[PDB]
């Protein structure tokens, strides 16, 4: 299996008195390990996975230092962006930041990234080469020249190829019991008559990690991307995920229909067929 | 672990 570390930051302006909202969360693959919330009492970076708790006070203090710099920078940013777009202080605006890194099965650097958005739309992003920027509009171009002068991309490449990669490895080792597991899907099928001459078949996948899964339905082994309701992969609450797919079927003809489950924890891909 | 250097837009 390959692996990722990702940090997601969301800052939101609240017009007038008091302060804006800031939420930061860290992920290793699809497992949240940290958070900071500005409305929380502690004003510290907090653990959200038992394997990170064992980190020392020097870790937690440093991460609390850095996340406050992230927080304060985002607040500064909100005013600047309001200034670039010539916007009033009355409106509520959202800033979002995402950065992190992926590794191969060899646990070497595969790619790094750093994406930034304003009101739910791409503003500026670092390219896969990590030396140059992709600006969305004229305001972002103004930031691009400033970040180019400040050698921001050099600093990010250093973190993304170096520090990011090393801490991911450590987290994968320290949290191996949870992070390096692969819970395969527990599958089954259900049958419900919808009319006189129609039935609904629903293919269920439960209790699986990681989240990436593929559920196809097939009629005579031909793909059926039409006539098929697919709910989004959703979280169970216990660190595993859930999904289902479904098809409307002319009753009598249930044995022609197959559901195909692909997943990391499945040695071979599964194939289900209804059986009374 | 978080990035250290964060530069304002």
């Amino acid at each position, epitope marked *: 299996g390959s692996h990722s570390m990702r940090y997601f930051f969301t800052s939101v302006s609240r017009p007038g008195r008091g302060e804006p909202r800031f939420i930061a969360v860290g992920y290793v693959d699809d497992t949240q390990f940290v958070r900071f919330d500005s409305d929380a009492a502690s*004003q510290r970076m907090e653990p959200r996975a038992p394997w990170i708790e064992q980190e020392g006070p020097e870790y937690w*203090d440093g991460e609390t230092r*850095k996340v406050k710099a992230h927080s304060q920078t985002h607040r500064v940013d909100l005013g600047t962006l309001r200034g670039y777009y010539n916007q009033s202080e009355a409106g509520s605006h959202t800033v979002q930041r995402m950065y992190g890194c992926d590794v191969g099965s060899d646990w070497r650097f595969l790619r790094g990234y750093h994406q930034y958005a304003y009101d739910g739309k791409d503003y500026i992003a670092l390219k896969e080469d990590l030396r140059s920027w992709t600006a969305a509009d004229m305001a972002a171009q103004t930031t691009k020249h400033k970040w180019e002068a400040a*050698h921001v991309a050099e600093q990010l490449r250093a973190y993304l190829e170096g520090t990011c990669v090393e801490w991911l490895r450590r987290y994968l080792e320290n949290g191996k019991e949870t992070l390096q597991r692969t819970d395969a899907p527990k599958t089954h099928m259900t049958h419900h008559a919808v009319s006189d001459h129609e039935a609904t078949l629903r293919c269920w996948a439960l209790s699986f990690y990681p989240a990436e899964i593929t559920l196809t339905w097939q009629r005579d082994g031909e793909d059926q991307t039409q006539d098929t309701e697919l709910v989004e992969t959703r979280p169970a609450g216990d660190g595993t995920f859930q999904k289902w797919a479904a098809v409307v079927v002319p009753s009598g003809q249930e044995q022609r229909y197959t559901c195909h489950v692909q997943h990391e924890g499945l040695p071979k891909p599964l194939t289900l067929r209804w059986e009374p | 672990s978080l990035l*250290m250097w964060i530069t304002q837009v």
Partner: T-cell receptor
Framework: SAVISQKPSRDIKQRGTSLTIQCQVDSQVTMMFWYRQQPGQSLTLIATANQGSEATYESGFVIDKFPISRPNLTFSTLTVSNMSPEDSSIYLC????????????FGPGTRLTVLE | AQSVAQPEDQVNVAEGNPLTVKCTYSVSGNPYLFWYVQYPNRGLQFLLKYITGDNLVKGSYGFEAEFNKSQTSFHLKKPSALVSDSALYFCAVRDINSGAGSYQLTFGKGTKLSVIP
């Protein structure tokens, strides 16, 4: 260019009293620090003024003696409580971004003479 | 860790000669370097900084410094001194590889330059 007002500029007070120095900034800025220096001598960092929480103090400096408050990113105060002759020095409000290249600015200073 | 030594408290020069304010640095990772000046009854004013790229960095009033990796130095230089340049001069380093979240610059003790007319 970030300009830094400090008020008061000069103040003479006596053992046991407390002075509360202000630091205003013309725009909103990321990091804020409180430095303390003797004339013609090295800077000593007191603490780091975090927006919306207790300041992070340096070894030898405690919140009981050196209250710090930062309501805005533009405004902060350092109070120096139960003063004594040794606490006499220049108190500097420093400011700057959290970027790698970003420059760290200082302010006019506040001369504190503490007498018995 | 990170630190800078300014090994000279007082530096003297005649007006119009070369002035040299010396600074070395020690750093675990890679350095961004800084110079600051203080005239009486004021905060530290910014002079110049080596971010990256060109080792020779030019600033204001004919001030400069060269980034020398081998001697681990960033000495401030100016070809001909004026009297107004008599001040307290501070060197400062930033370990760009640090991940500990102490953002402040780490300064030296200070070298007092006296440009005698």
């Amino acid at each position: 260019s970030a300009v830094i007002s400090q008020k008061p500029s000069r103040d003479i007070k006596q053992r046991g009293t407390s002075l509360t120095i202000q630091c205003q900034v013309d725009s909103q800025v990321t990091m804020m620090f409180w430095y303390r220096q003797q004339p013609g001598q090295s800077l000593t960092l007191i603490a780091t003024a975090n927006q919306g929480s207790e300041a992070t103090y340096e070894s030898g400096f405690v919140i009981d003696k050196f209250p710090i408050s930062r309501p805005n990113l533009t405004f902060s105060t350092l109070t120096v409580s139960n003063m004594s002759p040794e606490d006499s020095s220049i108190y500097l409000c420093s400011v700057g971004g959290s970027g790698g290249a970003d420059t760290q600015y200082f302010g006019p200073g506040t001369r504190l003479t503490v007498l018995e | 860790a990170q630190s800078v030594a300014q090994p000279e408290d007082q530096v003297n020069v005649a007006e119009g000669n070369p002035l040299t304010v010396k600074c070395t640095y020690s750093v675990s990772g890679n350095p961004y370097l800084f110079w600051y000046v203080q005239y009486p009854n004021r905060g530290l004013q910014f002079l110049l900084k080596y971010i990256t790229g060109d080792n020779l960095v030019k600033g204001s009033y004919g001030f400069e410094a060269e980034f020398n990796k081998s001697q681990t130095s960033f000495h401030l230089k100016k070809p001909s001194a004026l009297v107004s340049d008599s001040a307290l001069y501070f060197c400062a380093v930033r370990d760009i590889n640090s991940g500990a979240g102490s953002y402040q610059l780490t300064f030296g003790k200070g070298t007092k330059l006296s440009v005698i007319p």
